[PDB]
């Protein structure tokens, strides 16, 4: 599913991401935009043979099981395919564990490079929340 900007913002808010570990909703929407262009089915392969999945591009090296990332973990205890669902629950829950792991949203390279230090509240402007 390809979300609209405000539709995703709303869904994220309902799933408890607005200000989760201090990151305002625009942070999460901005991160989704640049990770996946709001497409739950986005996948991308990494140089190490791992793969990123879903709206927040969660990596099979640490967080999910895809059956093809040797010597990886599955810290969210989910098949990586679950991160591609139109239902973003699994992505959100896994993102909460990731953002709690010590580096905050710096875990998402696109967040650090295109969202951090910018006016992220622009991403939720106009939305009914
Ligand atoms: Cl933090």
UniProtKB/Swiss-Prot annotation:
Its main location: secreted. Disulfide bonds join 6-127, 30-115, 64-80, 76-94. It is found in: Secreted. In the egg white and polymorphonuclear leukocytes. Residues 1-129 form the C-type lysozyme domain. It comes from the Eukaryota. It catalyses: Hydrolysis of (1->4)-beta-linkages between N-acetylmuramic acid and N-acetyl-D-glucosamine residues in a peptidoglycan and between N-acetyl-D-glucosamine residues in chitodextrins. Lysozymes have primarily a bacteriolytic function; those in tissues and body fluids are associated with the monocyte-macrophage system and enhance the activity of immunoagents. Has bacteriolytic activity against M.luteus. Monomer. Belongs to the glycosyl hydrolase 22 family. This is Lysozyme C. It comes from Gallus gallus. The lineage of its organism: Eukaryota, Metazoa, Chordata, Craniata, Vertebrata.
